[PDB]
Design a protein around this ligand. Structure first.
Ligand SMILES: CC(=O)N[C@@H]1[C@@H](O)[C@H](O[C@@H]2O[C@H](CO)[C@@H](O[C@@H]3O[C@H](CO)[C@@H](O)[C@H](O)[C@H]3NC(C)=O)[C@H](O)[C@H]2NC(C)=O)[C@@H](CO)O[C@H]1O
Ligand SMILES: [Cl-]
Ligand code: NA
Length: 129
């Protein structure tokens, strides 16, 4: 599923991401935009053999199991395919664990390079939350 900007903002808010660990909603929407372009089915392979999954591009070497990342941790205790669902619950739940330790949102490279230090509030402009 390819989410709309305000549509995603509303779902994330509902799932308790607004100000989770001090990170305002604009940060999460900005992160999703540059990590997956709001596409829940996005996947990307890395050089170490791991793969990033879903709207928040969660990595298989640490957070989920895809059965092909030799010696990887499954910290969110879920198969990576659960992160590609049109329902973002699984992704949000795992994201909460990720940001809870580590370097906070720096775990998302697109956030660190394209959202951090910018006016993230603009990502939720015009939305009815
Ligand atoms: C969205 C996403 O999947 N991002 C991935 C990053 O999570 C990943 O970074 C590495 O994450 C692990 C787990 O949080 C880090 O390990 C932890 O590091 C802290 C210190 O910051 C330490 O106190 C924790 O005990 C330790 N936990 C474990 C289980 O080892 C690790 O430092 C991160 N590594 C780096 C280079 O940032 C990166 C790198 O694989 O990939 C992203 O896709
Ligand atoms: Cl933090
Ligand atoms: Na894994």
């Amino acid at each position: 599923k390819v989410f709309g900007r305000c549509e995603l903002a509303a779902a994330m808010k509902r799932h308790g991401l607004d100000n989770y660990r001090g990170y305002s909603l604009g940060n999460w929407v900005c992160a999703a935009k540059f990590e997956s372009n709001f596409n829940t089915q996005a996947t990307n392979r890395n050089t170490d053999g791991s793969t990033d999954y879903g709207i928040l591009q969660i990595n298989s070497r640490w957070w989920c199991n895809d059965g092909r990342t030799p010696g990887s941790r499954n910290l969110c205790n879920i198969p990576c395919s659960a992160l590609l669902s049109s329902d973002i619950t699984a992704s949000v739940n795992c994201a909460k664990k990720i940001v809870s330790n580590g370097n906070g949102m720096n775990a998302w490279v697109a956030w660190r390079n394209r959202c951090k230090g910018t006016d993230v509030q603009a990502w939720i402009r015009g939305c009815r939350l």
